[PDB]
């Protein structure tokens, strides 16, 4: 993975040695090239994964998350050009440095071969993430949102470190390939009940799990646009990727330990979807949407069926592009009205015609209109849970109805009705803004033609 | 607040509309149009503020018992099937200032004549501020009615948006 790690490092020298006025031109241009070469990771085999060295490996689960990861950085640079237009040059280059470093740790997290190395990079992402939220945030609550984000993650990660070290002593190695062949059954005992919790509660917090999600509305709302984009697209999926990997060494105890977490997620997505119906803040409505979507991923991973794992993988890719786009859409309005209230500015379709077409496409995917991968990811999960228990179709059905209600309500409030009279600064949509949205929806609608590349290893 | 006379006048208008909906046919409606008027005409002379008002409350309460469940509404009135139909074609005037220079060049006269109003607005704005702050009581206005211009060359205060509202069929 040095063919991708090393170029990601060279972006840091590139930014600092570039001319004063070309930091945005150089960084965006070269990070796009890095993304283009990331398509070479699709050299996948039906029987064996793609193993490069003793440190890194790539398979059908890591690959889609890697291409999503490297694809987001160029978009995050475009989204940040407005609010950093009048920033000190040596601070514009520190902001880009944090974004580059965050990608560096991410590309090594998903390809990590040893779970302890995965843990270190899994934990190293807090540092650049926390700095962005607290340093380049706008509101007074950015200080209190970094604290909530920080100690929620550590509170779960610290027990995880103890569990992983215990496993290596008991088994011998944390190399993922070795575990596949040396996996042993987890007998039901009080000591193994807490080994299961340590291994999982670290990743349940990052999904997040209902009841452990309070850090997300604070973190995703106070963070800048770039922070929200990465937070809601990739960092949420580190919990999903971890659970998909570590559930290998937790059977058969997952059969009964997974009950309290399924109910929290099955019932959690109704409660969190309902909240979206009554949100006074637009950027906060999108934040609560992610919690609802990730409930299906938590439920999908725990039931442990080939269909659910295929559905879970495609849902994380689908949500990453869709959720990031909605944050960008809500941010374009903010850069004009400079207020996150949803009802402040309405009827924006009259003033910004084309920009109200990206909203429609964003909302249609967000409510899983087929044949979008958003629906494919959701559909497979529903099929898997039906076999798990026929009754779950009730909750899946109810959540679908609510999901469309808060999605079209968001569309109708901002894009329809009568334009607010006392607002006279709704300038025409810029090419930077329009091009930003196209780079979300267009690659999303192309994955429907060949969806097999995002269905995970069990495809 | 509404005066007692206005409320009776309002009830007279509402009852005829509901009555018209039931009757449908003009001649049948025309016959009962006078009969209702007769009931209102006779009690015109009642000069007792207590007795007269008591008649109104029964009049209101008889109407609510006999109102049409589906009264006829004019198409563009609130509730009619044209209300706010064309609000989607009404774009505020200030959107023109964002037009590209090559896009303005297609209407040289309209934008040339537009600058006259914008120039007129800026010139008259400060005078409109002075006119209102001298006629305004110490505690501020007590009613929402506004005064007109009281000189030659002056325009009524707060006139721009009343004058420059979008048309009823802008497209």
């Amino acid at each position: 993975m040095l063919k991708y790690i090393i170029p990601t490092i060279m972006l840091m020298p590139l930014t600092w040695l570039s001319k004063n006025n070309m930091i945005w031109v150089n960084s965006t241009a070269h990070s796009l090239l890095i993304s283009f070469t990331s398509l070479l990771l699709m050299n996948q085999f039906g029987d064996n994964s793609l193993n490069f060295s003793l440190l890194f490996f790539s398979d059908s689960l890591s690959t889609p998350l890697l291409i999503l990861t490297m694809w987001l950085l160029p978009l995050m640079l475009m989204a940040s050009q407005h609010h950093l237009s009048k920033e000190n040059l040596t601070r514009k280059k520190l902001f880009i440095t944090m974004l580059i470093s965050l990608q560096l740790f991410l590309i090594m997290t998903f390809t990590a071969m040893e779970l302890i190395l995965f843990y270190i990079l899994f934990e190293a992402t807090l540092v650049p993430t926390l700095i962005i939220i607290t340093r380049w945030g706008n509101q007074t609550e950015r200080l209190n949102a970094g604290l909530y984000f920080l100690f929620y993650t550590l509170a779960g990660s610290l027990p995880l470190l103890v569990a992983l070290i215990y496993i290596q002593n008991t088994v011998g190695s944390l190399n993922f390939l070795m575990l596949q062949y040396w996996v042993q059954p987890v007998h039901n005992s009080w000591s193994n009940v807490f080994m299961w919790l340590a291994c999982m509660m670290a990743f349940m917090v990052k999904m997040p799990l209902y009841g452990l999600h309070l850090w997300l509305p604070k973190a995703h709302v106070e963070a800048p646009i770039a922070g929200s984009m990465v937070l809601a697209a990739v960092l949420l999926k580190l919990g999903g990727y971890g659970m998909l990997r570590i559930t290998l060494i937790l059977n058969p105890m997952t059969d009964f330990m997974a009950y309290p977490f399924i109910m929290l997620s099955l019932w959690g997505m109704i409660m969190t979807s309902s909240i979206c119906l009554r949100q006074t803040d637009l950027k906060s409505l999108i934040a609560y949407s992610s919690v609802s979507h990730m409930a299906l991923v938590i439920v999908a991973i725990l039931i442990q069926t080939p269909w659910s794992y295929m559905g879970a993988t495609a849902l994380m890719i689908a949500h990453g592009l869709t959720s990031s786009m909605l944050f960008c859409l809500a941010n374009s309005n903010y850069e004009r009205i400079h207020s996150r209230t949803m009802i402040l500015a309405r009827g924006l379709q009259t003033l910004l015609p084309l920009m109200a077409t990206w909203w429609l496409l964003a909302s249609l995917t967000n409510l899983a209109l087929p044949p979008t991968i958003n629906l494919i990811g959701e559909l497979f999960v529903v099929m898997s849970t039906f076999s798990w228990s026929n009754i779950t179709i009730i909750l899946m059905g109810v959540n679908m109805v609510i999901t469309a209600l808060y999605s079209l309500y968001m569309l109708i409030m901002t894009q329809r009705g009568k334009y607010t009279y006392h607002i006279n600064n709704i300038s025409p949509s810029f090419t930077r803004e329009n091009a930003l949205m196209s780079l979300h929806i267009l690659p999303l609608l192309l994955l429907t033609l060949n969806p097999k590349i995002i269905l995970g290893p069990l495809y | 607040y509404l005066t007692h006379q206005q409320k009776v006048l309002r009830l007279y208008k509402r009852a005829l509309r509901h009555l018209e909906s039931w009757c449908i046919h003009r001649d049948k409606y025309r016959y009962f149009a006078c009969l209702l008027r007769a009931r209102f005409d006779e009690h015109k002379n009642e000069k007792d503020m207590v007795k007269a008002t008591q008649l109104l409350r029964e009049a209101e309460e008889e109407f609510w018992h006999g109102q049409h469940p589906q009264p006829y509404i004019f198409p563009e009135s609130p509730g009619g099937t044209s209300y706010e139909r064309y609000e989607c074609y009404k774009v505020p005037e200030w959107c023109l200032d964002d037009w590209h220079p090559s896009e303005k060049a297609m209407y040289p006269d309209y934008f040339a004549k537009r600058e006259q109003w914008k120039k007129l607005r800026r010139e008259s704005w400060e005078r409109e501020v002075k006119q209102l702050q001298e006629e305004t009581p110490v505690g501020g206005p007590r009613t929402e009615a506004l005064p007109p211009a009281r000189k030659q060359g002056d325009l009524p205060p707060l006139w721009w948006h009343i004058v420059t509202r979008p048309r009823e069929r802008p497209m």
């Binding site: 910004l352 025409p428 810029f430 090419t431 | 505020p92």
Partner: peptide
């Protein structure tokens, strides 16, 4: 009779 129709900028 042709009347000017106000619209948002379409150039961009």
């Amino acid at each position: 009779k042709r009347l000017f129709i106000i619209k948002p900028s379409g150039f961009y």
